[PDB]
Protein backbone atom coordinates (compact mmCIF):
# COMPACT_ATOMS: atom_id res chain seq x y z
CA UNK A 1 0.00 0.00 0.00
CA UNK A 2 3.17 2.14 -0.32
CA UNK A 3 4.65 0.54 -3.43
CA UNK A 4 5.73 3.70 -5.38
CA UNK A 5 3.61 4.15 -8.54
CA UNK A 6 4.56 3.33 -12.12
CA UNK A 7 6.72 6.02 -13.79
CA UNK A 8 6.72 6.73 -17.56
CA UNK A 9 9.59 9.18 -18.26
CA UNK A 10 10.46 9.79 -21.96
CA UNK A 11 14.07 8.79 -22.68
CA UNK A 12 14.14 9.76 -26.39
CA UNK A 13 11.96 10.20 -29.46
CA UNK A 14 9.37 7.41 -29.52
CA UNK A 15 11.23 5.76 -26.62
CA UNK A 16 9.96 5.81 -23.06
CA UNK A 17 11.23 4.39 -19.82
CA UNK A 18 8.60 2.70 -17.67
CA UNK A 19 9.80 2.15 -14.09
CA UNK A 20 7.87 -0.27 -11.81
CA UNK A 21 8.43 -1.56 -8.27
CA UNK A 22 8.23 -4.69 -6.04
CA UNK A 23 9.91 -6.46 -3.07
CA UNK A 24 10.24 -10.28 -2.75
CA UNK A 25 14.02 -10.96 -2.72
CA UNK A 26 14.56 -8.96 0.48
CA UNK A 27 16.12 -5.99 -1.26
CA UNK A 28 12.86 -4.19 -0.43
CA UNK A 29 11.30 -2.16 -3.26
CA UNK A 30 13.31 -3.09 -6.37
CA UNK A 31 12.63 -0.73 -9.36
CA UNK A 32 12.31 -2.14 -12.89
CA UNK A 33 13.22 -0.07 -15.94
CA UNK A 34 11.66 -1.24 -19.17
CA UNK A 35 11.21 0.65 -22.41
CA UNK A 36 8.14 1.48 -24.30
CA UNK A 37 9.12 1.98 -27.93
CA UNK A 38 6.90 3.71 -30.49
CA UNK A 39 6.82 2.91 -34.22
CA UNK A 40 4.47 5.41 -35.85
CA UNK A 41 1.46 4.72 -33.60
CA UNK A 42 2.47 1.20 -32.64
CA UNK A 43 3.72 0.95 -29.07
CA UNK A 44 6.04 -1.89 -28.05
CA UNK A 45 6.76 -3.07 -24.51
CA UNK A 46 10.43 -3.86 -24.06
CA UNK A 47 9.75 -5.72 -20.94
CA UNK A 48 6.65 -5.62 -18.83
CA UNK A 49 6.17 -4.09 -15.33
CA UNK A 50 6.00 -6.55 -12.45
CA UNK A 51 2.21 -6.70 -12.26
CA UNK A 52 -0.88 -6.87 -14.44
CA UNK A 53 -2.07 -3.64 -12.86
CA UNK A 54 0.96 -1.56 -13.86
CA UNK A 55 0.81 -3.13 -17.31
CA UNK A 56 -2.70 -1.90 -17.78
CA UNK A 57 -1.54 1.49 -16.50
CA UNK A 58 1.35 1.42 -18.99
CA UNK A 59 -0.94 0.32 -21.86
CA UNK A 60 -3.80 2.73 -21.12
CA UNK A 61 -1.36 5.70 -20.89
CA UNK A 62 -0.10 4.93 -24.41
CA UNK A 63 -3.48 3.71 -25.61
CA UNK A 64 -5.04 6.99 -24.38
CA UNK A 65 -2.35 9.10 -26.14
CA UNK A 66 -3.39 7.63 -29.50
CA UNK A 67 -0.91 4.76 -29.87
CA UNK A 68 -2.14 1.15 -30.22
CA UNK A 69 -0.08 -1.47 -28.36
CA UNK A 70 1.17 -3.83 -31.08
CA UNK A 71 3.32 -6.16 -28.98
CA UNK A 72 5.29 -7.12 -25.87
CA UNK A 73 8.81 -8.50 -25.71
CA UNK A 74 10.23 -9.98 -22.52
CA UNK A 75 14.01 -10.04 -22.09
CA UNK A 76 14.12 -13.07 -19.76
CA UNK A 77 11.84 -15.35 -17.74
CA UNK A 78 11.91 -13.46 -14.43
CA UNK A 79 8.74 -11.46 -13.72
CA UNK A 80 11.12 -8.47 -13.90
CA UNK A 81 10.36 -8.95 -17.58
CA UNK A 82 7.37 -11.30 -17.85
CA UNK A 83 5.14 -9.87 -15.12
CA UNK A 84 2.60 -8.57 -17.67
CA UNK A 85 2.37 -11.45 -20.16
CA UNK A 86 -0.76 -12.87 -18.46
CA UNK A 87 -2.55 -9.53 -18.81
CA UNK A 88 -1.43 -9.01 -22.39
CA UNK A 89 -2.64 -12.54 -23.34
CA UNK A 90 -6.00 -12.04 -21.64
CA UNK A 91 -6.34 -8.86 -23.72
CA UNK A 92 -4.85 -10.90 -26.58
CA UNK A 93 -2.18 -8.29 -27.16
CA UNK A 94 0.65 -10.39 -28.72
CA UNK A 95 3.50 -11.37 -26.41
CA UNK A 96 7.01 -12.40 -27.52
CA UNK A 97 9.81 -14.33 -25.80
CA UNK A 98 12.56 -16.70 -26.92
CA UNK A 99 12.04 -20.45 -26.95
CA UNK A 100 14.47 -20.47 -24.01
CA UNK A 101 12.34 -17.96 -22.14
CA UNK A 102 9.10 -19.81 -22.90
CA UNK A 103 10.64 -23.08 -21.77
CA UNK A 104 11.80 -21.44 -18.54
CA UNK A 105 8.39 -19.90 -18.00
CA UNK A 106 6.70 -23.32 -18.43
CA UNK A 107 9.11 -24.77 -15.88
CA UNK A 108 8.23 -21.92 -13.52
CA UNK A 109 4.40 -22.37 -13.79
CA UNK A 110 4.15 -19.05 -15.56
CA UNK A 111 1.95 -18.36 -18.58
CA UNK A 112 4.10 -18.20 -21.70
CA UNK A 113 4.34 -15.63 -24.43
CA UNK A 114 2.08 -16.41 -27.40
CA UNK A 115 5.00 -15.95 -29.81
CA UNK A 116 8.51 -17.49 -29.91
CA UNK A 117 11.61 -16.38 -31.72
CA UNK A 118 14.87 -18.24 -31.55
CA UNK A 119 18.46 -17.79 -32.69
CA UNK A 120 20.96 -14.95 -32.33
CA UNK A 121 18.68 -12.12 -33.50
CA UNK A 122 14.98 -11.47 -33.99
CA UNK A 123 13.83 -8.43 -35.93
CA UNK A 124 10.67 -7.83 -33.94
CA UNK A 125 10.40 -4.68 -36.06
CA UNK A 126 12.52 -4.79 -39.23
CA UNK A 127 15.27 -2.14 -38.93
CA UNK A 128 13.70 -0.68 -35.80
CA UNK A 129 13.72 -3.10 -32.84
CA UNK A 130 16.25 -5.93 -32.65
CA UNK A 131 16.56 -8.79 -30.20
CA UNK A 132 20.06 -10.10 -29.64
CA UNK A 133 21.03 -13.14 -27.59
CA UNK A 134 24.59 -12.69 -26.17
CA UNK A 135 24.34 -16.12 -24.53
CA UNK A 136 23.80 -17.24 -20.88
CA UNK A 137 24.41 -14.54 -18.25
CA UNK A 138 21.98 -13.13 -15.65
CA UNK A 139 19.77 -16.06 -16.69
CA UNK A 140 20.24 -18.76 -19.39
CA UNK A 141 17.74 -17.06 -21.65
CA UNK A 142 18.57 -13.38 -21.28
CA UNK A 143 18.31 -11.32 -24.46
CA UNK A 144 18.67 -7.59 -25.19
CA UNK A 145 16.93 -5.14 -27.48
CA UNK A 146 18.75 -2.95 -29.96
CA UNK A 147 17.37 0.34 -31.29
CA UNK A 148 18.96 1.05 -34.72
CA UNK A 149 16.70 4.00 -35.62
CA UNK A 150 18.77 5.33 -32.70
CA UNK A 151 21.65 3.83 -30.69
CA UNK A 152 19.83 2.54 -27.62
CA UNK A 153 20.38 -0.81 -25.94
CA UNK A 154 18.06 -2.38 -23.44
CA UNK A 155 20.43 -4.60 -21.40
CA UNK A 156 17.60 -5.61 -19.08
CA UNK A 157 18.65 -7.66 -16.04
CA UNK A 158 21.77 -8.72 -17.96
CA UNK A 159 23.57 -5.40 -17.45
CA UNK A 160 24.49 -5.52 -13.74
CA UNK A 161 27.17 -2.77 -13.26
CA UNK A 162 27.35 -2.56 -9.45
CA UNK A 163 27.36 -6.33 -8.88
CA UNK A 164 25.47 -9.11 -10.59
CA UNK A 165 22.59 -9.26 -8.10
CA UNK A 166 20.21 -12.22 -8.24
CA UNK A 167 22.31 -15.30 -9.01
CA UNK A 168 19.70 -18.06 -8.43
CA UNK A 169 19.17 -18.78 -12.13
CA UNK A 170 22.48 -17.28 -13.27
CA UNK A 171 25.11 -19.02 -15.40
CA UNK A 172 28.27 -17.46 -14.06
CA UNK A 173 30.83 -19.53 -15.95
CA UNK A 174 29.25 -18.41 -19.25
CA UNK A 175 28.42 -14.79 -18.36
CA UNK A 176 31.87 -13.17 -18.88
CA UNK A 177 31.87 -14.58 -22.44
CA UNK A 178 28.28 -13.49 -23.14
CA UNK A 179 29.23 -10.03 -21.85
CA UNK A 180 32.30 -9.83 -24.09
CA UNK A 181 30.22 -10.56 -27.21
CA UNK A 182 27.67 -7.92 -26.17
CA UNK A 183 30.39 -5.25 -25.70
CA UNK A 184 31.74 -6.28 -29.13
CA UNK A 185 28.71 -6.25 -31.44
CA UNK A 186 27.07 -3.53 -29.32
CA UNK A 187 29.75 -0.94 -29.27
CA UNK A 188 28.44 2.27 -30.86
CA UNK A 189 25.99 2.28 -27.95
CA UNK A 190 24.77 5.73 -26.95
CA UNK A 191 22.32 4.68 -24.26
CA UNK A 192 22.46 1.38 -22.39
CA UNK A 193 19.35 0.92 -20.21
CA UNK A 194 19.79 -1.60 -17.35
CA UNK A 195 16.87 -3.20 -15.46
CA UNK A 196 17.89 -2.13 -11.98
CA UNK A 197 20.06 0.96 -12.47
CA UNK A 198 20.23 4.42 -13.95
CA UNK A 199 20.71 4.68 -17.73
CA UNK A 200 24.30 4.95 -18.93
CA UNK A 201 26.45 4.28 -22.01
CA UNK A 202 28.67 1.67 -23.66
CA UNK A 203 30.86 1.46 -20.56
CA UNK A 204 28.05 -0.30 -18.73
CA UNK A 205 29.07 -3.13 -21.07
CA UNK A 206 32.65 -2.87 -19.79
CA UNK A 207 31.42 -2.51 -16.22
CA UNK A 208 29.17 -5.54 -16.59
CA UNK A 209 31.95 -7.56 -18.25
CA UNK A 210 34.07 -6.63 -15.21
CA UNK A 211 31.44 -7.54 -12.63
CA UNK A 212 30.98 -10.82 -14.57
CA UNK A 213 34.57 -12.04 -14.38
CA UNK A 214 34.75 -11.07 -10.69
CA UNK A 215 32.02 -13.51 -9.69
CA UNK A 216 33.67 -16.18 -11.85
CA UNK A 217 36.64 -16.42 -9.45
CA UNK A 218 34.92 -15.15 -6.29
CA UNK A 219 32.99 -18.45 -6.35
CA UNK A 220 35.66 -21.04 -7.20
CA UNK B 1 40.12 -3.47 -10.78
CA UNK B 2 37.63 -0.78 -11.94
CA UNK B 3 35.23 1.22 -9.81
CA UNK B 4 32.79 3.41 -11.78
CA UNK B 5 34.20 6.94 -11.99
CA UNK B 6 32.96 10.10 -10.25
CA UNK B 7 30.13 11.94 -12.06
CA UNK B 8 29.38 15.70 -11.83
CA UNK B 9 26.02 16.58 -13.47
CA UNK B 10 24.19 19.95 -13.54
CA UNK B 11 21.09 19.81 -11.31
CA UNK B 12 20.14 23.51 -11.30
CA UNK B 13 21.38 27.12 -11.38
CA UNK B 14 24.54 26.70 -9.28
CA UNK B 15 23.67 23.21 -7.99
CA UNK B 16 25.15 19.88 -9.11
CA UNK B 17 24.99 16.20 -8.23
CA UNK B 18 28.32 14.46 -7.71
CA UNK B 19 27.97 10.66 -7.75
CA UNK B 20 30.76 8.56 -6.22
CA UNK B 21 31.19 4.83 -5.93
CA UNK B 22 32.61 2.30 -3.53
CA UNK B 23 32.17 -1.32 -2.63
CA UNK B 24 30.25 -1.39 0.63
CA UNK B 25 30.39 -4.71 2.53
CA UNK B 26 27.94 -7.34 1.25
CA UNK B 27 25.95 -4.47 -0.31
CA UNK B 28 28.39 -4.36 -3.29
CA UNK B 29 29.30 -1.28 -5.42
CA UNK B 30 27.13 1.41 -3.82
CA UNK B 31 26.67 4.85 -5.53
CA UNK B 32 26.59 8.01 -3.37
CA UNK B 33 24.94 11.29 -4.36
CA UNK B 34 26.09 14.62 -2.97
CA UNK B 35 25.66 18.22 -4.11
CA UNK B 36 28.00 20.95 -5.09
CA UNK B 37 26.32 24.28 -4.48
CA UNK B 38 27.49 27.58 -5.96
CA UNK B 39 27.01 30.92 -4.24
CA UNK B 40 28.42 33.73 -6.35
CA UNK B 41 31.73 32.17 -7.42
CA UNK B 42 32.02 30.28 -4.13
CA UNK B 43 31.62 26.50 -4.07
CA UNK B 44 30.21 24.30 -1.31
CA UNK B 45 30.31 20.52 -0.98
CA UNK B 46 27.04 19.21 0.35
CA UNK B 47 28.49 15.87 1.19
CA UNK B 48 31.87 14.52 0.11
CA UNK B 49 32.67 11.49 -2.12
CA UNK B 50 33.96 8.35 -0.40
CA UNK B 51 37.64 8.95 -1.08
CA UNK B 52 40.23 11.67 -1.11
CA UNK B 53 40.80 10.86 -4.81
CA UNK B 54 37.18 11.58 -5.72
CA UNK B 55 37.13 14.59 -3.44
CA UNK B 56 40.18 16.07 -5.07
CA UNK B 57 38.67 15.40 -8.50
CA UNK B 58 35.45 17.13 -7.43
CA UNK B 59 37.36 20.09 -5.92
CA UNK B 60 39.97 20.80 -8.62
CA UNK B 61 37.13 20.33 -11.16
CA UNK B 62 35.34 23.36 -9.74
CA UNK B 63 38.47 25.39 -8.99
CA UNK B 64 39.24 24.72 -12.67
CA UNK B 65 36.12 26.62 -13.80
CA UNK B 66 36.96 29.57 -11.53
CA UNK B 67 34.95 28.74 -8.40
CA UNK B 68 36.66 28.86 -4.96
CA UNK B 69 35.78 25.99 -2.59
CA UNK B 70 34.50 27.81 0.48
CA UNK B 71 33.67 24.68 2.50
CA UNK B 72 32.19 21.17 2.81
CA UNK B 73 29.18 20.14 4.87
CA UNK B 74 28.77 16.52 5.96
CA UNK B 75 25.23 15.25 6.51
CA UNK B 76 26.18 12.40 8.85
CA UNK B 77 29.15 10.57 10.28
CA UNK B 78 29.25 7.66 7.84
CA UNK B 79 31.96 7.63 5.15
CA UNK B 80 29.38 8.26 2.47
CA UNK B 81 29.27 11.90 3.65
CA UNK B 82 32.59 12.38 5.50
CA UNK B 83 34.94 10.48 3.23
CA UNK B 84 36.42 13.78 2.02
CA UNK B 85 36.91 15.64 5.29
CA UNK B 86 40.51 14.69 5.72
CA UNK B 87 41.54 15.70 2.25
CA UNK B 88 39.60 18.88 2.78
CA UNK B 89 41.27 19.62 6.16
CA UNK B 90 44.73 18.91 4.69
CA UNK B 91 44.20 21.67 2.13
CA UNK B 92 42.76 24.01 4.78
CA UNK B 93 39.40 23.84 3.02
CA UNK B 94 36.84 24.43 5.84
CA UNK B 95 34.76 21.34 6.75
CA UNK B 96 31.44 21.52 8.59
CA UNK B 97 29.57 18.86 10.59
CA UNK B 98 27.20 18.87 13.55
CA UNK B 99 28.53 18.38 17.05
CA UNK B 100 26.77 14.96 16.89
CA UNK B 101 28.46 14.10 13.59
CA UNK B 102 31.77 15.24 15.08
CA UNK B 103 31.32 13.28 18.28
CA UNK B 104 30.38 10.21 16.20
CA UNK B 105 33.41 10.64 13.93
CA UNK B 106 35.73 10.79 16.95
CA UNK B 107 34.11 7.64 18.31
CA UNK B 108 34.78 6.04 14.95
CA UNK B 109 38.49 7.02 15.01
CA UNK B 110 37.74 9.33 12.08
CA UNK B 111 39.21 12.80 11.54
CA UNK B 112 36.57 15.38 12.45
CA UNK B 113 35.27 18.42 10.64
CA UNK B 114 37.15 21.58 11.58
CA UNK B 115 33.88 23.47 12.11
CA UNK B 116 31.04 22.44 14.39
CA UNK B 117 27.38 23.48 14.47
CA UNK B 118 24.27 22.62 16.52
CA UNK B 119 20.51 23.11 16.84
CA UNK B 120 17.59 22.30 14.53
CA UNK B 121 18.64 24.84 11.90
CA UNK B 122 22.07 26.09 10.91
CA UNK B 123 22.54 28.74 8.24
CA UNK B 124 25.75 27.69 6.53
CA UNK B 125 25.09 30.56 4.09
CA UNK B 126 22.36 32.91 5.34
CA UNK B 127 19.16 32.55 3.21
CA UNK B 128 20.89 30.22 0.74
CA UNK B 129 22.05 26.99 2.42
CA UNK B 130 20.17 25.63 5.43
CA UNK B 131 21.02 22.68 7.62
CA UNK B 132 18.02 20.93 9.20
CA UNK B 133 18.21 18.26 11.92
CA UNK B 134 15.05 16.05 11.80
CA UNK B 135 16.24 13.82 14.65
CA UNK B 136 17.77 10.28 14.80
CA UNK B 137 16.95 8.11 11.77
CA UNK B 138 19.50 6.55 9.42
CA UNK B 139 21.97 7.60 12.10
CA UNK B 140 21.74 9.51 15.42
CA UNK B 141 23.40 12.61 13.95
CA UNK B 142 21.34 13.15 10.89
CA UNK B 143 21.08 16.34 8.93
CA UNK B 144 19.56 17.46 5.66
CA UNK B 145 20.37 20.54 3.60
CA UNK B 146 17.66 22.91 2.43
CA UNK B 147 18.31 25.12 -0.59
CA UNK B 148 15.68 27.92 -0.38
CA UNK B 149 16.26 30.11 -3.45
CA UNK B 150 15.78 26.98 -5.60
CA UNK B 151 13.49 24.99 -3.28
CA UNK B 152 15.85 21.96 -3.33
CA UNK B 153 16.40 19.47 -0.47
CA UNK B 154 19.40 17.21 0.05
CA UNK B 155 17.88 14.39 2.14
CA UNK B 156 21.10 12.37 2.38
CA UNK B 157 21.28 8.77 3.65
CA UNK B 158 18.12 9.79 5.61
CA UNK B 159 15.82 9.57 2.60
CA UNK B 160 15.68 5.77 2.07
CA UNK B 161 12.50 5.31 -0.07
CA UNK B 162 13.08 1.71 -1.18
CA UNK B 163 13.98 0.36 2.30
CA UNK B 164 16.17 1.63 5.12
CA UNK B 165 19.42 -0.20 4.30
CA UNK B 166 22.29 0.09 6.80
CA UNK B 167 20.78 -0.05 10.32
CA UNK B 168 24.04 -0.68 12.17
CA UNK B 169 24.00 2.86 13.57
CA UNK B 170 20.29 3.34 12.88
CA UNK B 171 17.66 4.39 15.40
CA UNK B 172 14.48 2.85 14.02
CA UNK B 173 12.34 3.56 17.08
CA UNK B 174 12.87 7.35 16.60
CA UNK B 175 13.18 7.48 12.76
CA UNK B 176 9.39 7.60 12.11
CA UNK B 177 8.97 10.77 14.21
CA UNK B 178 12.01 12.36 12.55
CA UNK B 179 10.65 11.77 9.02
CA UNK B 180 7.23 13.02 10.12
CA UNK B 181 8.98 16.23 11.08
CA UNK B 182 10.96 16.42 7.84
CA UNK B 183 7.84 15.66 5.72
CA UNK B 184 5.98 18.58 7.29
CA UNK B 185 8.69 21.27 7.54
CA UNK B 186 9.80 20.37 4.00
CA UNK B 187 6.77 20.53 1.79
CA UNK B 188 7.28 23.13 -0.95
CA UNK B 189 10.03 20.80 -2.19
CA UNK B 190 9.83 19.23 -5.62
CA UNK B 191 13.54 18.52 -5.75
CA UNK B 192 14.26 15.99 -3.02
CA UNK B 193 17.66 14.29 -3.40
CA UNK B 194 18.18 10.84 -1.83
CA UNK B 195 21.63 9.48 -0.96
CA UNK B 196 21.52 6.25 -2.89
CA UNK B 197 18.47 6.59 -5.16
CA UNK B 198 17.26 8.53 -8.17
CA UNK B 199 16.47 12.18 -7.52
CA UNK B 200 12.75 12.57 -6.73
CA UNK B 201 10.05 14.88 -5.36
CA UNK B 202 8.14 15.43 -2.10
CA UNK B 203 6.77 11.87 -2.19
CA UNK B 204 10.18 10.71 -1.05
CA UNK B 205 9.19 12.12 2.38
CA UNK B 206 5.93 10.17 2.16
CA UNK B 207 7.85 7.05 1.15
CA UNK B 208 10.64 7.39 3.73
CA UNK B 209 8.02 7.84 6.45
CA UNK B 210 6.34 4.72 5.10
CA UNK B 211 9.59 2.71 5.08
CA UNK B 212 10.48 3.86 8.62
CA UNK B 213 7.16 3.05 10.27
CA UNK B 214 7.22 -0.32 8.49
CA UNK B 215 10.66 -1.16 9.86
CA UNK B 216 9.43 0.00 13.27
CA UNK B 217 6.92 -2.85 13.54
CA UNK B 218 8.93 -5.31 11.44
CA UNK B 219 11.52 -4.74 14.21
CA UNK B 220 9.33 -5.98 17.08
CL1 LIG C 1 -3.57 -15.09 -20.15
CL1 LIG D 1 13.16 -13.62 -24.08
CL1 LIG E 1 17.23 -17.03 -25.52
CL1 LIG F 1 22.83 8.19 -11.28
NA1 LIG G 1 18.04 -9.27 -20.05
ZN1 LIG H 1 16.05 -11.48 -13.32
ZN1 LIG I 1 15.92 -8.56 -11.94
ZN1 LIG J 1 25.08 6.14 6.22
ZN1 LIG K 1 24.82 5.47 3.20
Amino acid sequence: ESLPDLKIEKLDEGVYVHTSFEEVNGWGVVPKHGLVVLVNAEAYLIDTPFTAKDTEKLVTWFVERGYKIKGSISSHFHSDSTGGIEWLNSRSIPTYASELTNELLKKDGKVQATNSFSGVNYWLVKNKIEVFYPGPGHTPDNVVVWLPERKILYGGCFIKPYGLGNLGDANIEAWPKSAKLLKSKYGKAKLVVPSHSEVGDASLLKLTLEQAVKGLNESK
Side-chain angles (χ1 to χ4, degrees), chain A:
Chain A
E1 58 177 347
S2 297
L3 149 105
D5 293 53
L6 178 62
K7 306 201 281 100
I8 311 175
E9 300 168 296
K10 205 196 211 328
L11 183 65
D12 189 74
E13 202 57 71
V15 169
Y16 283 85
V17 186
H18 72 86
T19 295
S20 47
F21 301 89
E22 193 89 297
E23 185 178 8
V24 193
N25 204 69
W27 277 320
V29 181
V30 162
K32 207 333 203 67
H33 310 143
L35 314 178
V36 203
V37 150
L38 313 173
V39 179
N40 54 283
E42 301 163 323
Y44 282 95
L45 307 203
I46 303 313
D47 273 345
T48 76
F50 293 102
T51 56
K53 191 203 270 294
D54 294 356
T55 312
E56 189 258 38
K57 281 174 165 74
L58 182 49
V59 161
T60 46
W61 199 87
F62 285 81
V63 163
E64 101 90 15
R65 260 148 262 248
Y67 306 137
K68 19 264 90 214
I69 167 59
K70 210 67 182 153
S72 140
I73 195 144
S74 308
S75 69
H76 68 137
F77 77 105
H78 288 156
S79 47
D80 251 17
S81 302
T82 63
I85 291 181
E86 260 145 88
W87 199 78
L88 297 160
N89 293 182
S90 72
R91 298 278 166 301
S92 65
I93 290 157
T95 53
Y96 285 93
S98 76
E99 281 203 83
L100 301 185
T101 299
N102 265 333
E103 203 290 314
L104 285 158
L105 299 158
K106 204 177 97 85
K107 262 51 271 299
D108 207 11
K110 288 219 221 77
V111 170
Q112 332 204 170
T114 65
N115 292 288
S116 286
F117 59 86
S118 138
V120 177
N121 356 54
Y122 193 51
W123 278 111
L124 171 64
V125 173
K126 193 32 162 250
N127 310 321
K128 288 195 180 302
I129 297 166
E130 192 188 62
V131 196
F132 172 80
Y133 174 69
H138 181 242
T139 46
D141 66 319
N142 44 217
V143 292
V144 295
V145 193
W146 171 224
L147 298 186
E149 39 146 320
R150 164 63 73 221
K151 304 173 175 198
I152 281 162
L153 185 66
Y154 182 75
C157 279
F158 177 86
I159 301 280
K160 289 256 202 178
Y162 299 143
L164 306 161
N166 177 54
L167 282 186
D169 298 319
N171 183 346
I172 192 45
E173 312 73 41
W175 200 334
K177 312 197 164 169
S178 301
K180 232 188 76 150
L181 176 78
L182 195 55
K183 66 151 167 67
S184 328
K185 188 58 221 299
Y186 294 97
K188 296 164 192 166
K190 291 180 296 206
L191 280 192
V192 175
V193 186
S195 274
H196 304 285
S197 301
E198 301 111 332
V199 195
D201 49 359
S203 58
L204 288 193
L205 303 196
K206 196 191 192 53
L207 293 188
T208 294
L209 171 50
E210 277 173 334
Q211 279 288 186
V213 296
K214 183 190 198 60
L216 175 52
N217 52 46
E218 257 57 292
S219 27
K220 70 173 174 161

